[PDB]
Design a protein around this nucleic acid. Sequence first.
DNA 1: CATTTTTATACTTTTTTTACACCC
DNA 2: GGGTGTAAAAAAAGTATAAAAATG
Lengths: 222, 226
Amino acid sequence: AMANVLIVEDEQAIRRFLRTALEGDGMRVFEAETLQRGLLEAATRKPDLIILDLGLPDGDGIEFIRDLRQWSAVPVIVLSARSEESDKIAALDAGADDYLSKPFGIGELQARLRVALRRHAPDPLVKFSDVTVDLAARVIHRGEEEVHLTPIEFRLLAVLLNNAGKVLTQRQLLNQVWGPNAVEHSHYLRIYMGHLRQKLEQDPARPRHFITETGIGYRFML
Amino acid sequence: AMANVLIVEDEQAIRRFLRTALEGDGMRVFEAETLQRGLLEAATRKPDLIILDLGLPDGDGIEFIRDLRQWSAVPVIVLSARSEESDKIAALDAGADDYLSKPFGIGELQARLRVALRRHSATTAPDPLVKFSDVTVDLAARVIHRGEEEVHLTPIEFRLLAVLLNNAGKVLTQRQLLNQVWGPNAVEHSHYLRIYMGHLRQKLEQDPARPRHFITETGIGYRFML
DNA sequence: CATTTTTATACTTTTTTTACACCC
DNA sequence: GGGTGTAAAAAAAGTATAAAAATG
């Protein structure tokens, strides 16, 4: 039916204008003013498309794109005040699908929106032990009943699974789960790795899928 | 592992530019000088991506896109010297996946190519392995195998093995490698190297007493083979 | 209230130290 | 005998888990 579009934008005027324009084209519109709320709404609302303004202060748009790409393949169209090539390349390599420099023609945006939308196999499941993981749907089934992970736990699991077979350093896991401002706190990582092992391993005391690489970091297997 | 990009372009300057851009980050280039030739090769050569210049004189590029879209869903990125948005909208509605207007940089072009290609051509190619005897080493994944089984190395052992692997055949002095494994403060502690090379030897060699890959250069340092 | 962060303590791995055999 | 290879300790660094305090 109607396409669900999530708009992460801090400027009120642009939010209203875009809401008018996109609702006029027959799309259900959701907005977020911050990146964290935008990620939250991305998880809960499951939009078919995300418009993201890089001019958001509270965090980093690239960080948003990466965090989102840890589990979601939803098309992301970025709008920006800058038109510097380095920013385009960075955003696109982070996982963005398109880039527009402000100001732009609304018709062009509608066009690229249609292009992004019309590009749409079931979700890849990761199976190990008796656990079934669906990253795209953010659901995990141990055995046959759903097991609940907290936001940090799920992000950690997503990072580990996306790098299946490869060991990740504590710096990497911390940077990708908590962020750049908390890379000295390896104990966070120990604790939450503990949570994951507790919830998912058949024997939390002796892991067979969430392996400790002593002195380095951690690694998911199978 | 190569991406087959077909460029539809007649002007030699832009074609040169596109060739340097495409060969820039490891791709293969098919060329077509007319729209008809473009369709023909689009079918016969099965490109992973088509870069199409709308500046082509032989006909309408948008109708090229419409004709192509009747039997192919290959990504097409459209180039243009104009920037009138109606042309953009027409091209995108026609079936194009992206639209670049002058002036386009080589970097942004390459980036957008990567974007258009990572939808289908993304299959996660296995990490490159370093092999000798029945030992397998994945530097990226930080995992070592010996036979079917997995061999665990401690961090220092791994740093050492990595440095040795990077310098296969070359003779390393104890000083310059102590400066690379431990650091610039244990440069005289040449006893650590002995016991730890002993660890690499008994962990990896078939006969740890008679090393085939971890050879010692008495007086100067060590040297790794294979 | 669920969740994250701080706090405290038992535990395991790795590094360094220190020891005794080697060998042309 | 200077330079080199196994083995075992003592020392240092790193890890697991619980549980209370803080966050919003």
